[PDB]
Amino acid sequence: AWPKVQPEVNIGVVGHVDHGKTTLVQAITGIWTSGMTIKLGYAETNIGVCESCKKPEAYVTEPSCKSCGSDDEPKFLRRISFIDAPGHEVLMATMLSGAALMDGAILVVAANEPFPQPQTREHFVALGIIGVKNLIIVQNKVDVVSKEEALSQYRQIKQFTKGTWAENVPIIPVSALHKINIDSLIEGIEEYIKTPYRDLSQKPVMLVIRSFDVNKPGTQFNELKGGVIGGSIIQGLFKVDQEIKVLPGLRVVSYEPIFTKISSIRFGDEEFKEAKPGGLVAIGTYLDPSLTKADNLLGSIITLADAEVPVLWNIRIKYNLLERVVGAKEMLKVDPIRAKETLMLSVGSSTTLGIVTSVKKDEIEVELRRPVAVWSNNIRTVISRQIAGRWRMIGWGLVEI
Amino acid sequence: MIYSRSKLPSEGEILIATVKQVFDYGSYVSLDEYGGLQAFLPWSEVSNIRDVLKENRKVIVKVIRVDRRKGTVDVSLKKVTDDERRKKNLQWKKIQRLDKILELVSQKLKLSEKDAWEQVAWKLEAKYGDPITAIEKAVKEGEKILIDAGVPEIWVKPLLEEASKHAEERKVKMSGLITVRTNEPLGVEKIKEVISKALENIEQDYESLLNIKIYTIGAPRYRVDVVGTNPKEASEALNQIISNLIKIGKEENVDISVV
Ligand SMILES: Nc1nc2c(ncn2[C@@H]2O[C@H](COP(=O)(O)OP(=O)(O)NP(=O)(O)O)[C@@H](O)[C@H]2O)c(=O)[nH]1
Ligand SMILES: [Mg+2]
Ligand SMILES: [Zn+2]
């Protein structure tokens, strides 16, 4: 007897590359994010428990208990969604992007590999630095290792998850490929990744990670659907028919706000009348599909029209740096930040470039190539530097206003 | 030819007429839907007039007065409403499809159009409906639709066949690629306006033709299709359109151009 409701929580799925992030997500939802991941993947699932029987196994994905023991229709707890991040060292930029929609995450370490892999460390300290603390570790490719190997590693993961903020960060081996043990993971995520409270009084603010022209080639101007802007709500809640604006909006140099009305609200295959935090919405707008196609409005933010939002070109940042540059094979020490340096400031789901203009103990001023739309005074920011051809995360901070 | 089942047109009626002669103190038009019954269009009733009041243009007009006694008629193109000018215009292409068919079916059956309009079209008229739509069903369904109407069975087949493979070897396609951008909050409506404003009443001016489509092929790149009977009315219609777009657009906050 289940209901059709939009996702309650967003759970990122990070990890070194090819350790099987998308597969695990496909083992929990049946859906897969269309080879290697390049753009953030997305999937939804209803999560229910079997009142009448034994857990892990008691955690149902569909309204059915006649799967292990018996019959009363299991009870609905929530509909969760995942943010399937890429893992290739080059796409780091886009995971941080996704990290800003994460309410909790699932680091995925490959059993059949030397645990501390470059991206395994990066995604790990990346979460800690950001705030995504509700973590669950998942040893995954067990189906192809020694019963001692996969246990020697568990040791290391256990070792690693020590000094850090990963106190009891569960480690659950699974076999995303054979969907083995996924039951306990649901037991896990249904315990450690608890849906957060959402004050809907706050000013509606959505982070955009996608936008596209829905119109199939050949659609007559007659039935042209307006552009769709895909994102994730961080606070408050939007509803169809609202006057909204996209920031920094379209560019001219400057960036003047793109205004529109919420034509539609959709989550997964079903259409709703309102959207709130958790889950990934597709805001249907009445604007020319051109403005929002490939993914033009990625990194923007949507807020109701006539909202007080600073769109800065220059931004002050109270920061901190990592002692080493976990991410390159070589753990090279992070060099001080030098003025006139070009850095990659990742803010919200947006990623931007800017040349450091000022540098003090824990505060730097960046002149961005593109403005950022600052909706709060805490906007977490992560800083990457182009260490060696590839962009590496060397620190983080807070944007001040 | 479109023989009518009446001598004169009902007063206050609308109908496609064609300008046959322009004189000083007036102009004789010709009522198509009535064997080309000559009516009179007096200046006091008219209103670039150079293109409406043309040598052979086909404009739609109201039937001012009808003198059943002298059997003469006067019409006006001013009294015709903007509503009556669109609705009673779609009737044209339909009544213009029925025409070409019969003029061909008969030409083939070494018969006459009047014979083609009294047995076919006139009878399909009883079976409620533009005889052209009752034929619409025939080709798809079966020649059982006509026979039930009482359409002498000399036409039935000659019709069906001649109806299908007609537009084919009578069809030509012209198209252009344009770019349409907007920043308007409802710019998708403005595009659904500027297009359906520029692509308006075109079925009369650049005249007749067969079909027009405007679609999205890319994001801002759209295409326009003008498939008609006369190859040489290609751009004629396509150019006016592509221009109408630019004009209305370059004036409706919608940026439009050709590739
Ligand atoms: N034996 C085994 N193979 C697995 C397991 N999970 C994933 N694989 C395999 O590992 C490969 C890559 O998996 P995939 O899920 O794409 O990895 P990913 O981490 O999401 N890739 P990316 O970082 O590019 O987004 C595939 O061939 C997949 O079948 C597992 O549990 N056991
Ligand atoms: Mg993948
Ligand atoms: Zn059960």
Q: What's a concise summary of this model?
A:
The complex is a heterodimer of chains A (401) and B (259). With 401 residues, chain A is mostly beta strands.
Secondary-structure map with pairings?
The complex is a heterodimer of chains A (401) and B (259).
Chain A: E1 9-13, H1 21-29, E2 41-49, E3 59-60, E4 75-84, H2 92-99, E5 104-109, H3 118-130, E6 135-139, H4 149-160, H5 182-192, E7 205-212, E8 228-235, E9 238-239, E10 243-251, E11 255-267, E12 270-272, E13 274-275, E14 281-285, E15 301-304, E16 311-321, E17 342-347, E18 350-360, E19 363-373, E20 380-388, E21 390-400
Parallel strand pairs in A: 1-4, 1-5, 5-6
Antiparallel strand pairs in A: 2-3, 2-4, 7-8, 7-15, 8-14, 9-13, 10-11, 10-15, 11-12, 11-14, 16-19, 16-21, 17-18, 17-20, 18-19, 20-21
Helix pairs in contact in A: 2-3
Chain B: E1 14-23, E2 26-31, E3 37-41, H1 49-52, E4 58-67, E5 72-76, H2 84-108, H3 113-124, H4 131-140, H5 144-147, H6 156-169, E6 172-181, H7 187-198, E7 212-216, E8 221-228, H8 234-249, E9 255-258
Helix pairs in contact in B: 2-3, 2-6, 7-8
Bound molecules: phosphoaminophosphonic acid-guanylate ester, magnesium ion and zinc ion (ZN).
Organism (chain B): Saccharolobus solfataricus (strain ATCC 35092 / DSM 1617 / JCM 11322 / P2) (Sulfolobus solfataricus)
Pfam families (chain B): EIF_2_alpha, S1
Function (chain B): eIF-2 functions in the early steps of protein synthesis by forming a ternary complex with GTP and initiator tRNA.
Describe the structure in your own words.
The complex is a heterodimer of chains A (401) and B (259). With 401 residues, chain A is mainly beta. Chain A has helices at residues 21-29, 92-99, 118-130, 149-160, 182-192, and strands spanning 9-13, 41-49, 59-60, 75-84, 104-109, 135-139, 205-212, 228-235, 238-239, 243-251, 255-267, 270-272, 274-275, 281-285, 301-304, 311-321, 342-347, 350-360, 363-373, 380-388, 390-400. Chain A has three domains: 1-198, P-loop containing nucleotide triphosphate hydrolases (Rossmann fold, 3-Layer(aba) Sandwich), CATH 3.40.50; 199-308, Translation factors (Elongation Factor Tu (Ef-tu), domain 3); 309-401, Elongation Factor Tu (Ef-tu), domain 3, CATH 2.40.30. Chain A is built from five helices and 21 strands. In chain A, helix 2 packs parallel to helix 3 (118-130). The longest helix of chain A is centred in the N-terminal third of the chain and has 13 residues, at 118-130. In chain B, 29% of the residues are buried. Chain B is an alpha+beta fold. Chain B is 37% helix and 24% strand. Chain B has a five-stranded antiparallel beta sheet with strand order 3-2-1-4-5, covered by helices on one side. Chain B has a four-stranded antiparallel beta sheet with strand order 7-8-6-9, covered by helices on one side. Chain B is built from eight helices and nine strands. Chain B has three domains: 1-80, Beta Barrel (OB fold (Dihydrolipoamide Acetyltransferase, E2P)), CATH 2.40.50; 81-171, Translation initiation factor 2, subunit 1, domain 2 (DNA polymerase, domain 1, Orthogonal Bundle), CATH 1.10.150; 172-259, 2-Layer Sandwich (Alpha-Beta Plaits). In chain B, helix 7 crosses helix 8 (234-249). In chain B, a hairpin with a 5-residue loop joins strand 2 and strand 3 (37-41). Chain A binds chain B through residues 213, 215, 217-222, 224-227, 250, 258-261, 286-291, 293, and chain B through 180-189, 191-192, 195-196, 213-220, 222. Magnesium ion binds next to helix 1 of chain A. Residues 15, 17-23, 36-37, 86-88, 140-141, 143-144, 175-177 of chain A line the site of phosphoaminophosphonic acid-guanylate ester.
